[PDB]
């Protein structure tokens, strides 16, 4: 299968085209080439602050009969600073827009703090301390919900939720709408297998972010793992006859866990989603799943002694 099943029935693509970081000039011809490759599923945020590019994108492959509108997966985010209903309603159609869309697939509460309204997507005072806001991922839900029944977004999910925070919005008074996904960073030094056991059986699927370990990233540090030179995935990339990074990105498809690893490079776009001719064996995957080291390089990890951090508790 290529898919996997949400529980509205909706089937989510296991490979998508990940975006952040591209740059806005840059990510309207990677996705052009996704598209002629055959990826339909698109992860989007309001924060990459390149929807616009990734709509064009979009509206010039549909107009030239390439792909068709219902068989695409398209999804974005609602940044932290947005969490009020009426704010997020702004930043919604700001998102609907840019994309030129009718409707997004999937909507996401891009982490679970909110943050301070403004300008800044990281708003600051004089000494250098992120502002919070009194506005919770609950109160966000509640705006989201509306999206929902308008029409406008088809399905809701979150991201960096762990798994106290997902029982807390299903067991929220008066909820209509259960998330659908669990957006998180995902990789042999990450494996998430309390978490992905957890969302699985609570009718939630994963979505796995930085399957390469984001080598883009802009903090990045000699003393961090490397995901991509692990040396057991170059052993059982030679003998699938795949690259590294196939390996990377089957390790989770392999598991119905979907992978959204992002590439502005044609040749690697390409790569990224030729992961559905080739099975990793009982042993590969067991021994995948050994590296675990619960070693995150992803989040926003200033605001770690503010309150619904994610990442102190186990999973
Ligand atoms: N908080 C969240 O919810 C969250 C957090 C992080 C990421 N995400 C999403 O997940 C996506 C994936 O995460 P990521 O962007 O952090 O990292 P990643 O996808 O693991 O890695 C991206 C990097 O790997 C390189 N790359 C891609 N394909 C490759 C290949 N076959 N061989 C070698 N290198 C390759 C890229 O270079 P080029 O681009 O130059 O080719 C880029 O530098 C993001 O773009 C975004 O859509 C969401």
Same mark, same amino acid.
């Given at each position: ?8 029935? !909706?089937?989510?693509?296991? $490979? ?20 002629? !490759? ?19 994108? %979009?509206?010039?492959? %549909? ?10 997966? %398209? $999804? ?11 704010? *997020? ?5 700001? &998102? ?35 502002? *919070?806001?009194?506005? &919770? ?28 925070? #997902? ?28 978490? #992905? ?6 009718? %939630?699927?994963? #979505? ?35 690259? #590294? ?12 866990? !979907?992978?959204?690893?992002?590439? $502005? ?51």
């Amino acid at each position: 299968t290529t898919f996997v099943k949400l529980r509205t029935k !909706a089937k989510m693509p296991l $490979v998508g085209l990940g975006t952040w970081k591209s740059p806005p000039g840059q990510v309207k011809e990677a996705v052009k080439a996704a598209i002629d !490759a055959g990826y339909r599923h698109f992860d989007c945020a309001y924060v990459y602050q390149n929807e616009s590019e990734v709509g064009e994108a %979009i509206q010039e492959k %549909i107009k030239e009969k390439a792909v068709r509108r219902e068989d695409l997966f %398209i $999804v974005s985010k609602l940044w932290s600073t947005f969490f009020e209903k009426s704010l *997020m309603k702004e930043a919604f159609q700001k &998102t609907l827009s840019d994309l030129k869309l009718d409707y997004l697939d999937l909507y996401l509460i891009h982490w679970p703090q909110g943050l301070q309204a403004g300008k800044e997507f990281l708003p600051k005072d004089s000494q250098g301390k992120v502002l *919070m806001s009194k506005s &919770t991922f609950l109160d966000a839900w509640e705006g989201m919900e509306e999206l929902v029944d308008q029409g406008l977004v088809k399905a809701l999910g979150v991201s960096n939720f762990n798994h106290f925070q #997902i029982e807390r919005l299903l067991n929220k008074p008066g909820l209509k709408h259960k998330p659908v996904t669990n957006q998180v960073e995902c990789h042999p030094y990450l494996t998430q297998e309390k978490l #992905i056991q957890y969302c699985h059986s609570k009718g %939630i699927a994963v #979505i796995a972010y930085s399957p390469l370990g984001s080598p883009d990233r802009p903090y990045a540090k000699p003393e961090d793992p490397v995901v991509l030179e692990i040396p057991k995935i170059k052993e059982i990339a030679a003998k699938h006859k795949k690259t #590294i990074a196939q390996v990377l990105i089957r390790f989770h498809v392999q598991r119905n866990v !979907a992978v959204i690893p992002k590439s $502005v490079t044609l040749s690697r776009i390409k790569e990224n989603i030729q992961v559905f001719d080739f099975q990793l064996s009982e042993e590969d995957m067991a021994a995948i799943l050994s590296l675990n080291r619960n070693w995150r390089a992803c989040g926003l990890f200033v605001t770690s002694d503010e309150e619904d951090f994610p990442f102190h508790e186990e999973y």
